[PDB]
């Protein structure tokens, strides 16, 4: 293991454990090993995550492709089973420019899907001592066939499924290595379903992109699907009816990823609210204006 | 007395495949093994954990017949090959090609249809933090599938383990890979033991461990006929359209198409034809429609 | 690891004394050893003797950032109406050097109230394998503790530079994990990463994005060099009449905050040499600055 | 706790020991300790090798220099006791490119060579408990003193002898250190001679490439050579009197080692007989006698 | 082991046994089995009541019907022969779960002699001594004819064999396992074991404690009926007190966490009280905030 | 044990027990119970006062209310019975702090009788002495009913069990669980323990161990507290020495730290009149003395 002996860490494995336990109580009969067990603080339960697929706007197409074509698949095997070609993609690649949401569909499937969510982390792989590596990214595998219908989730997956080189590091290539075998090799994994995020589809090595059948382009935002974002973003504020020009904003906002549209929406909101702030501080809200941003807006 | 593989559900594992070993061959129950070669034992591939058969893999059936006559039947069936010293298995094994094109298939099939007793070993099961325990789960590997007398130790990904050995090599690696290299062509001989690997990058590795894989099979991307065949295995057991589906012309369009591009492909297109039928039964909690050549080519590029 | 070392450890618990005497409620928070590695790096207030009124120039930007990153962080009390209000997770100074970027970020450090972690490369790098993403992993994880909590990158365009395949794996691998914390499936708390930066265009689009507010330190204009002037040549002896800044500043063509920082030192030192001879055996004046402009 | 725990491990000790007594009754009197014992599973034995020196082909003249430099100054020391020149090296190195005959000449002087065998492996020398990997190498060259004509040979000899650095572990360091003190150090090794493999001869140590001067390289065949090796694999094996041309072959064949060569045969005898296995395995008379097109169409020409 | 309170120990627990069975007077009882006779447990040594054990009831209901009836009521199992007792017992899991309690509740309300032995009773420094003690327990254990050996943290008796444990202490193993399944078997007899570390005991050890009962870490649920019965018998406020949110905020907490959160919850609540009976009405009755000034949320 | 001077130290603990308490008279006690009896410290052997230790106020007065009051004044908390002293407790933190000194303070003015057993006592070559040694450590504690095991370093001791320990490690960590927490409980005994390294202890071990005080570094005010405890008894300067400065100036240092400032202050302080007593008063402490030293 050597790196679940903290006790702080075994507390988080604990709470992670009863979490899992309590959605699924099935799962009371699995034991898990010491480096099973050292994964489990990587399990991200729905509790851990605040957003949900509604606040996720302009994806709408790719929200339902996912769910139609990865989400029941994988969640539903019984209605899936009329053909064994009905199944979930070994792997998942959302891949975009930075700020289109990624991230945001990964947060939407560990909350809104079924699936058992580990998110992992090269730092929670990636041991000094002599071998460990390999059976951390075993016993990862191991604990998500397991827990049956799980996602393993690595963020900027590109550089974990880096192009193998000649100058790439023993650990790694066998990290790599050991990836590809059990993500496809001999034994089959059971609703295993490895989801990954990243800018760079380049850079994601061939027999580790083949590996992510299943691929999804966050791409930026259209007119329309930056109105969505819009109407996502300045949802629980004033939006007064009259003073607000949504179809203006949107178009204004030429090659603006969401990221961009979250920061000119705080901005707004920072500068319409900023009288109510200094009253607050020394002790209502405006409603926002389409002046407020496009004062923001360059145009 | 390793320090790893001593755990209760793998001690249980050990059991099963030996189980499994015994009743497959029964010659195997006079056999005794060192705790080494126990652990060992859980890599040990039995042919009913593996679903795939030879029939199961299209466009490769010259490979696939050439890989029986030169590898599975000189191994399998030495009687009948025993009567020139040159008629016997190669030493090694190289399943080598473009991603996605077979190698993990015909290693599939090897594990299941040739009869030998195989050994799926991957670097977590070598590698050990403890002072040459590497080196002993090495030696231990090659005893065992010495024991296992036809036997056939399988490394995925072999273009990590026997990478070309340089002096920035880790120290256990190192004495790892020259203990392979001696117990693999060396003193001593091993009897009926073949080593198979399958890579995508040949060039990584060592010129010494490519020399002990003297077979090799070039799993390249396939042709318009081979892609044809894969896509009539992938599309058994549903049903197809007649008079309608063109399956030669989504063959012919698919230039570059691996064989798990063309399996998620064909994934895709069941997952579309069926989305009214998937509909109607997550209602429920008529079948699915006959896939046709304009559902394949919705999606497929040109 | 560097907690091997004794001065290490020293400065870890005058670093972690420091911020339990700032926050009591750091008294029962617990840390990781990577994250006590980590608390070597935290720039706790009484060690910064740049304050916000040392800035010149900049006034409007210090107004601009305190409105829309100090008060959001450090008063979510006030902006909780609304869940737009918030601290935004990144904030980016850009421009020339020399502009008083380091300052900005100083004055943050000694005056916002939160705790500031200044990391680096070197002090980010490790020669074990997968220590420098521990590393990391633990700097955000310590900068969630501190819940109140700005990390400074200074010189942030080789730290987040545009990945490409020249990049070491170590290197892409930290930077890969610092998206990862930055912005992931696991919402930071009132964590603000900062960075001073010379060149926009080394920063990755991935890292820019997660940097949503961005400040131009440019280089000044002539009321803001009047007011750079003004304020370094505080507490400084000037004549009433002989000395006027106005054509100081208006002659000051090309003249970043450290050129005016220089020409200064200059003009007073050609002065106070006088002073110095005179100890061996007057006020300040335009003449010395002009003798010195080109 | 010791090495070698298991009982099969006894059985083979006891087996090879017996063996060694057989082949030498004087060693009958020599007692043997607990690592000399464990050292003596790695015993090679004549009968466990099937390789010859006529197995060998096309090194021939690296053959009669290993002879006259190596196996007569330690096999025979009455016939060089006239000189103290004339003696056995300390050690023997076989480098060259993978597959050009290292092992089978190792393989040889195991069978050939009257001197005992230990064909040792780092599985049996690393252990991970404190000090034994020391004792064990210390008893290693204690048996190899005490089976007077020894040759202690270690396939794979840059891994085992590897550049020293300030990044090897303390026991491997150590071990190496043991190494070198017993193989040339103050008290003397009377006709104990250290054979290594290796295909990188510059990934061995400065300190023990000395104590292996005599070096052997075992380099990539000749047109000649080639010839030769062909002849040596295709022996007892049935060859086309006429439509046969092996010098074609050996010509065709520039680049290609011992392993090589051996595959080609095999794959070619395994083509030219195809007709015969497939009747055989139709019935489960002749195997059609080799030709140059069956090495042709497996060749790139 | 021999001295003058351990045999006044010795001689209250044969009285107590043979006042508690009168077919167990009469019985003539070796020095080993006299000196393993002072850790017999009675019940009135115990007080613990399976009632006392909150969520494992599916446990305590499955340790009636597969362990405590068979071992007490042979009659009732008697018409068929493979419906006996089993030959042991293992209670394995995370520590702070009810192991002991389970433990405690069987010696007293099973109804079984208890016999719970530790290691200082077993090793003995003379030569060939501790074998006869365990020789002795098991002969002891016959004569009591319901009889429950219970070793409490087994791992470290059952351990791994290995060759760096001592002549004694392989021998000791040795005769347990000779004695637990051998040549003539003992009667109604089981060895009831707990431990935190299962793997660490023996394969044979194991194959001879067969049915297993894993006391894990409780669930919400589970909390509720602990933090339930650990407040039994205490003073509740009717409406501020919320057992739900406190269990449901006690995540990852074991029983023993339970026990020790009660206990600080119950003295910050009372410290008033406390307080004012040591410078000189009644505890004050618990609420929930009392618990969340403890609580980490 | 079986020494002369160990049977002679078990005799007079005994008598001072049984004068301290009168009902302990009369009690047969076994040859490992004689023997650790040797390990009984008295409130004669320990001069530490609670008053000497500062800055630790609100974890004195935790300390008080929840381990020494509930075992023992059990008459106080006798209606509800969750008002029991714990089963353990820790002291746990960075070297320096008054954990051992709350030990000294615990032996002194608790009331409890006092069992500071170390790995000496306990570990034994001899098979199963150290069982039997733990068995009447508590059978000891047991028999003089409001009593205090203290294991100073308990981190060693209660260290994470392995299956690489030695058989009597492990025995006898096993036998301290059993006997702590199992059938037939202890009554008021209670087991305090220090260390520096609460991650090495058991999980179970943590668990018999629910009460648990952090003695962390101390912070301005709880170094300004233990200076002017440090320095009680001792002259100081009415107007040169100012301990607020000192104590500002102390950053990141412990009571270990500060007593051996202290100590170096008060030397270099009376140097001058050292060396004329060598020769053949103390001159007032002030704050020149204790900043020389200090590297601020
Ligand atoms: N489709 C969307 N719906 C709603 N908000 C969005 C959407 N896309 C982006 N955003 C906003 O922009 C932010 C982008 O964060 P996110 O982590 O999802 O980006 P990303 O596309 O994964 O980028 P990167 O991989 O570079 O981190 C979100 O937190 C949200 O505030
Ligand atoms: N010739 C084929 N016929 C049928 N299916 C195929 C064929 N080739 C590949 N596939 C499909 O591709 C999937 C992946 O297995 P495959 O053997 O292709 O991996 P691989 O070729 O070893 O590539 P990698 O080295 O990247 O693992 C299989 O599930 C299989 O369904
Ligand atoms: N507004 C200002 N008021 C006073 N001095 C200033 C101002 N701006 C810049 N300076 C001077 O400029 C010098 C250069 O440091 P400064 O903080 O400006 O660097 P910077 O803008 O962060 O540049 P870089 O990225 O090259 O480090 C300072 O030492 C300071 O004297
Ligand atoms: N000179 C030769 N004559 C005949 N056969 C040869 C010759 N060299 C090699 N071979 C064939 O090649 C096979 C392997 O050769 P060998 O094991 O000696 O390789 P090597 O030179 O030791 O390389 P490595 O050090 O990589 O093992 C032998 O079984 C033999 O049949
Ligand atoms: N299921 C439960 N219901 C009620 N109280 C419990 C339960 N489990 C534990 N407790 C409380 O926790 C205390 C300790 O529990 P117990 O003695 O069973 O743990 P243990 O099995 O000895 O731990 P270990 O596994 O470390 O030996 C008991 O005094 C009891 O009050
Ligand atoms: N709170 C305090 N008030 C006064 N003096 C103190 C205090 N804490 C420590 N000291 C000084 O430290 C000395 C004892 O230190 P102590 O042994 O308690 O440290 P510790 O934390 O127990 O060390 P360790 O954990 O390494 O055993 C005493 O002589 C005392 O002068
Ligand atoms: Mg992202
Ligand atoms: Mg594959
Ligand atoms: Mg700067
Ligand atoms: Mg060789
Ligand atoms: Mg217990
Ligand atoms: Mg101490």
Same mark, same amino acid.
């Given at each position: ?21 309590? *959605? ?71 891949? /975009?420019?930075?700020?289109? @949401? ?28 002599? /071998? ?34 000649? $100058? ?5 290539? $066998? ?34 992109? *083949? *590996? ?9 935002? @259209? ?29 204004? $906002?030429?090659?603006?990823? /969401? ?6 929406? *705080? ?22 204006? $389409? ?9």
């Amino acid at each position: 293991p050597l790196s679940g002996k903290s006790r702080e860490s075994k507390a988080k494995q604990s709470l992670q454990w009863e979490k899992l336990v309590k *959605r699924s109580p099935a799962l009371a009969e699995v034991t898990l090993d010491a480096y099973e067990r050292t994964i489990l603080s990587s399990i991200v339960t729905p509790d851990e995550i605040n957003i949900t697929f509604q606040d996720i706007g302009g994806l709408d197409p790719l929200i339902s492709d996912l769910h139609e074509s990865v989400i029941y698949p994988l969640m539903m095997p019984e209605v899936y089973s009329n053909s064994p070609l009905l199944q979930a993609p070994s792997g998942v690649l959302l891949y /975009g420019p930075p700020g289109c @949401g990624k991230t945001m569909l990964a947060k939407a499937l560990a909350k809104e899907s079924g699936a058992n969510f580990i998110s992992i982390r090269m730092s929670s792989i990636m041991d000094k001592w002599y /071998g460990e590596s390999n059976k951390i990214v075993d016993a990862m595998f191991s604990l998500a066939n397991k827990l049956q219908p799980c996602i393993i989730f690595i963020d900027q997956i590109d550089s974990f499924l880096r192009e193998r080189s000649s $100058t790439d590091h023993e650990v790694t290539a $066998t990290l790599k290595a050991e990836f590809m075998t059990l993500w496809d090799g001999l034994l089959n994994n059971g609703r295993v379903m490895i989801i990954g995020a990243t800018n760079r589809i380049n850079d994601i090595d061939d027999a580790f992109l *083949r *590996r992510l059948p299943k691929r999804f382009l966050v791409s930026l935002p @259209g007119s329309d699907q930056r109105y969505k974002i819009l109407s996502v973003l300045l949802k629980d504020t004033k939006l007064d009816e009259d003073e607000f020009d949504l179809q203006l904003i949107a178009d204004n $906002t030429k090659g603006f990823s /969401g990221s961009d549209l979250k920061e000119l929406c *705080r901005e707004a909101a920072l500068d319409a609210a900023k009288e109510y702030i200094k009253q607050k501080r020394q002790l209502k809200i405006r409603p926002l204006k $389409t002046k407020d941003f496009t004062k923001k807006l360059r145009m």
